[PDB]
DNA sequence: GCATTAACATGCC
DNA sequence: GGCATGTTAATGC
DNA sequence: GCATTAACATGCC
DNA sequence: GGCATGTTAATGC
């Protein structure tokens, strides 16, 4: 029914795969440990039973960038070699379940629906990243930040009297990483939005005091203002 | 064994799915016709038996951008709604095969390997677009153009005496669309590369006269030179 | 560091 | 011959 | 239009 | 208390 993500965190979780972790291999990591080491070739799907993984790509010159965050019931779909150098670290004590190709056949023979759940999980990732490429080719950095707050507000902002609240803990550093904008530009833009009384990004909530202005500004070509 | 793409054209073709098009629905399009209309909700996988599709996303303000090109044995993995407005046009007379969820079950009951072929096709797309996001966040437009020619040369350039040839018909307009660089910047960069005798992009071949210089320049922060 | 604009020139079922 | 692709330099976001 | 740099200030298992 | 996150303005790619 719907394969969408506004942010690259907890893409299409598959809670029913917890009924089949006995067909796969349990593997616990300590906080701070590598689930996937730089240069490690992975050929398993990795189901996250409990915890939190940060998953990054590393370029040849050593540059490192965020791809996504993974939480409980997330799926790392690295069953085959891809050409990318991936580094995935446990942000907390984390339980995984490693599903090889053979082990997946065993799961599908028991439950043919899990096939389509995995397709949904992949589709969601492709829809996210393909749009993000096209969005970066269409809107300027500062506009992409406004567009993110508008879309989170539309999709998950709760009306609370005069305002909308987005119940979400989200740092400026991550906003920058997700939107591809320098963290100092992120600080500047939020300063503006705050002092103009449009939006306040707090520790655990973003509060939108003025959605129609937020939206209007997101429709311009810059908000380096 | 390998889920890679340097360019968003002909991602992981699955030639064996042509053995199962009788389980799905044949649908022929004329050149210039919409395979997916703007705003059309698609819930089928669409296998391209013969021809060529150009597949674009359209934003709310009407901006339109390339996602990818599809050729024979390519797969459009839109089995479920995604939230994106997609517009896909037949660039030539094109035969498709539409596979619903029910129809895919029928295919998998006959050949369990087709499951994993589809996973490979999805993985390849996710690896492409996820890297492209991270690359646009890491390298400047002009550098991304150099990096593309270097990687195509590495991956598919054939040594021909003094040179490498990449046997590929690729317009400046598409290079721009793929790399997210204005077509006039693309023209400028190629002018430079040509007159410095590094590389010549012709109608049906790119010729690299100097791979080590190409590579060296791709390692700098700009080539607006 | 490059997008944009503009005015112009060459390619092409 | 008409519309799509490519060219070059200047201006400032 | 914004990344970068820099020098500084506030947050935090 | 130490290292990570956030702040603000200036400079020019
Ligand atoms: O491994 C890669 O190159 C990309 C990637 C990373 C994480 C995932 O869950 C997927 Cl499906 C792909
Ligand atoms: O439909 C989308 O939002 C993205 C998309 C487009 C084409 C494909 O083949 C896939 Cl797998 C996804």
Author numbering:
A (entry chain C), B (entry chain C): 9 to 233
Quote what the paper states about this structure.
The transcriptional regulator CprK from Desulfitobacterium spp. induces expression of halorespiratory genes upon binding of o-chlorophenol ligands and is reversibly inactivated by oxygen through disulphide bond formation. The CprK associated with the o-chlorophenolacetic acid (OCPA) reductive dehalogenase (CprAB) from D. dehalogenans and the closely related D. hafniense has been shown to bind OCPA with μM affinity leading to sequence-specific DNA-binding, and ultimately transcriptional activation of the associated cpr gene cluster. Members of this family are homodimeric and contain an N-terminal sensor domain linked via a long α-helix (involved in formation of the dimer interface) to the C-terminal helix–turn–helix (HTH) DNA-binding domain.
The asymmetric unit contains a single CprK monomer bound to the corresponding half of the (de)halobox DNA, with the CprK dimer and complete (de)halobox DNA related by crystal symmetry. As observed with CRP–DNA complexes, the DNA helix displays significant curvature (to approximately 80°) with the individual hinge points occurring at consensus sequence positions. It is likely that this particular interaction is responsible for the requirement of a purine and a pyrimidine at positions 18 and 19 respectively. In contrast, the hydrophobic contacts established between Val-192 of the recognition helix and T20 clearly leads to the strict requirement for a pyrimidine at this position.
